[PDB]
Every structure is written in structure tokens, then in C-alpha cells.
Amino acid sequence: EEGTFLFTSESVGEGHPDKICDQISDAVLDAHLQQDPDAKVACETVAKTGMILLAGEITSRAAVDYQKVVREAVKHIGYDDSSKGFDYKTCNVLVALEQQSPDIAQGVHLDRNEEDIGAGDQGLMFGYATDETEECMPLTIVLAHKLNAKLAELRRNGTLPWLRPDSKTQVTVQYMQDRGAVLPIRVHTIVISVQHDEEVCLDEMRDALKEKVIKAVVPAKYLDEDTIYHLQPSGRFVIGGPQGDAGLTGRKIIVDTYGGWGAHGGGAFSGKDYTKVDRSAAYAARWVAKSLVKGGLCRRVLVQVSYAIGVSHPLSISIFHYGTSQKSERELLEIVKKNFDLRPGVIVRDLDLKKPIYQRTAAYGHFGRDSFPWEVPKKLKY
């Protein structure tokens, strides 16, 4: 119908090779933070057949056993046997980690008061919130994440023992306009691809994916006789994980955020401590956006911030409310400036960003879940 449109988002499972890397990078970060809350961490992970490589820069007082940390993360994901294509017990773990560049350290944080630490890099970051779900997230990405979580649940509980950890999902929703906001109408198309054992047949998989995965996740009111299902569309997915496709940290940044809604500034989250504004300022911007929506000021909002390396205050803060506020964007920006301090050395205090909770963020999206500090709205004064 006129005024309607389709929009698609995707998500991936815990054993998707890029997500393996994000989780390992954040397991490394958490291990450092457990011993040194001020650790400077920039840990990239690369995964291919039989290999996890850590590359990057860490300056920390912690003593971290990288072999143990990496292998325990892979064990948790479920890659525990050569029959599955990857095994935490027997893979190669290679480490190419150096100290943080002293030139960066001197320009960012050396001899600086914590509240006045400089941004760890330049960059731009966005925060988004939408009233279309209680958790202020787009329905497309929420459903896509939940489909992957359901696969992992049914794998771990033994219901569908042919499942393996590598999966991808994609959800297309038909939306209608509503005064600048968007309203989901129906699910138009669902894709699910998941790695599987050599014995199970395609028809058994497709039936299970429809009846035990989709129907257990997606409300029936969104599904109808016209909904299109692409279930195991490649026909065979026995080879998977890093053996099927190289993984790298920071290659699922749209899955990690809003599924394509809002906007993205390009920076990856995993493997980075709070001085890297790619993560901390994106978390703070989500917190601002969600606070504006939960505060009743907007129904939908996009916030941009930006930084220069070594400079503590943002270079720019901007807000767009899609026509969903009675207040001008100028007024909302004044409210934001009166209620939030987006220096990284203040964000760290407000969002408790030295705490080792980051591995938990590294699958199923960083936003919309589990009442992390950036998901608890701030009560606004104005």
C-alpha cells in the first residue's frame, strides 16, 4: 500500500566466524580489566581454519594467559571437535600483540586527569532509538537476533543436535509511516542459514527451522500465507565456522548496532577499552537516544557525535528527531547538553566502562538487551 515499504536487517550467531572474533577480542579485554581496570586494549582477532590470531596493542599491568582465554571463549561458543570444523582443544592460537604506541599514549592519556583524558582516536558515532519496540530497537534486527539465539538454545539443549554454532538470519518487515515514526505491519521474508552435521537431510532441517525456530520466535500476527521463507537456501552447509569463511573482529558492525536503521560512523566495538570512543561514545549516544524516547520527548531519534584524537570534548553533537518531537532539534540539543557530558573520561563513570562485561555484548547486538548501563534511561531535567 502507498506509504508502506520493506526493510531488511540481518543477524549472525555466536559461531559465525566474525562474531567468534568479536567475542574473543572482548574476552581478552575482560581478562585484562579483571586485573587492571585501566588497561589500554586494542585487540583484533582473526580466525581461519585451525587458527585464532590476536593482533593489536595492549598496555596493561595484568598477567593474561591468552591460550586459556581464547580457548575458553571458543569452548563456550561450542566449537569442541574436529567433526564440527574447529576445536578449542587443538586449534592454533598465535599472538602478535605489542604495547600501545607511546605516541598515542602521550597524546591521549599520559599525565591527564581522568575526566580530561583525550579521545583515543578521531571519529564519528551515532546513537539511535525507535519506539516501535519496548526496548527501543527496530523490529527487524530484534527478530533477526532472536532467531540466532533460538538456534543456539536448541543446539545447547539437544533438541536439534544436528545444529552447529555458525548461523545467519535475515528478516524483511513491511512498515508503514506514522508521523515520522515507523510501524511494523508484517514479516515479508525470513532467511535462515545454519551449519549442520553430515547426516541430517534438507527437508528435516527446513521443517525444524520453520516449526521450532521461526514459530517459536516470530509472533503469528506477523506471519501469513504470503510470507516467504528461505531456509537453508544454499542447500548444504556442513563446512562452517572459520573453515568455511575467514572471520575478523569488527566486520559485523551493523549487526552490532541497529540492523541498518539510524546511522553508523564506521567504528567497531569489540576489543577496545573505554578510551576508544568508537565504543564508549557510541554507547553514550545510544544512552542519549534511548533517554530522549523513554523521556517522552521523541518517538524516534538519531544522535551524532564526533571527536579528535587527544581532545576530550566532542567536536560536534547533533540530533535529528524525524519530525517526532514537538520540540525543535535545537531545543533537544540544549536538553542533551544540559544532561550529558560526552567526554570519554566522564562516560566511563556514567556507564561503568571499566567493568569486565564486554564479552556479553559481543553477540546478539550491543543494544536493546539486558539492561546494560547505556540501556537504563537517564531522567532528564529541563
Ligand X SMILES: C[S@@+](CC[C@H](N)C(=O)[O-])C[C@H]1O[C@@H](n2cnc3c(N)ncnc32)[C@H](O)[C@@H]1O
DSSP letter string, 238-251: -S-GGGTS-EETTS
Asked whether position 133 contacts a copy of itself by CB under 8 A, the answer is: no
Residue 272 burial by Cβ neighbours in a 10 Å radius (0-12, 13-18, 19+): buried
The C-alpha atoms of residue 198 and residue 309 are separated, in whole angstroms, by 51
Using the contact rule CB under 8 A, the part of the chain among 30-38, 283-291, 310-318, 346-354 near a copy of itself is 310-318
Q: Which stretch binds a copy of itself (CB under 8 A): 62-70, 159-167, 323-331, 349-357?
A: 323-331
- On whether 61 is known to bind a ligand per the annotation, the reply is no
Is residue 93 within the footprint of a copy of itself (CB under 8 A)? Answer: no
CA-CA distance, 192 to 214, in Å (whole number)?
Answer: 9
Binding mask 210-249 for Cl ion (x = CB under 5 A): ----------------------------------------
Please tell me the distance from the alpha carbon of residue 218 to that of residue 213, in angstroms, as a whole number.
9
Contact stretch for ligand X (CB under 6 A) within 64-72, 229-237, 280-288, 298-306: 229-237
Is residue 360 flagged as an active site residue? no
42 is an active site residue: no
Contacts of 224 by beta carbon, 8 Å cutoff, 6+ apart:
186
Candidates 199, 203, 221, 236; binder of a copy of itself (CB under 8 A) is 236
**Active site (annotated) includes residue 207:** no
- Scan residues 173-202 and list those touching ligand X (CB under 6 A): 193
Q: Is there a catalytic annotation at residue 272?
A: yes
| Cα–Cα dist 358/7, whole Å | 30
Cβ within 8 Å of residue 131, ≥6 positions away: 181, 293, 299, 300
Binding flag, residue 265, ligand X (CB under 6 A): no
For position 107 contacting ligand X by CB under 6 A, the verdict is yes
Q: Which of 73, 77, 141 is nearest to 369 (CA)?
A: 141
- Given the rule CB under 8 A, which of 98-106, 205-213, 348-356, 357-365 is the region that contacts a copy of itself? 98-106
With binding defined as CB under 5 A, does residue 7 bind Cl ion? no
> Which position among 200, 309, 311, 317 is part of the footprint of ligand X (CB under 6 A)?
309
10 Å CB burial of residue 63 (0-12, 13-18, 19+) is exposed
**Cα 264–Cα 270–Cα 275 angle in degrees, nearest 5:** 85
Catalytic residue selected from 14, 22, 44, 256 = 44
What x-and-dash track marks residues 291-330 binding ligand WBG by CB under 6 A? -----------x-x-------------xxx-x------x-
Q: According to the binding rule CB under 8 A, does residue 107 interact with a copy of itself?
A: yes
Choice between 103 and 225, CB closer to ligand X: 103
Identified binder of ligand WBG from the candidate list 37, 50, 107, 260, rule CB under 6 A: 260
Q: Is 168 designated active site?
A: yes
- The CA angle 248-354-135, to the nearest 5 degrees, is 75
Q: Which three cell numbers stand for residue 115?
A: 575526566
| 3-class SS of residue 193 | strand
Supply 309's cell numbers. Answer: 584524537
CA-based nearest residue to 176, from 115, 132, 232? 132
- Min CB(185)–ligand X separation in Å: 29
Is 212 known to be catalytic?
Answer: no
- Known binding-site positions for Mg(2+): 18
Q: Can you give the binding site for ligand WBG, defined by CB under 6 A?
A: 3, 5, 7, 177, 179-180, 182, 260-261, 263, 302, 304, 318-320, 322, 329
- Active-site amino acid positions: 16, 18-19, 44, 57, 168, 237, 245-246, 251-252, 272, 276, 278
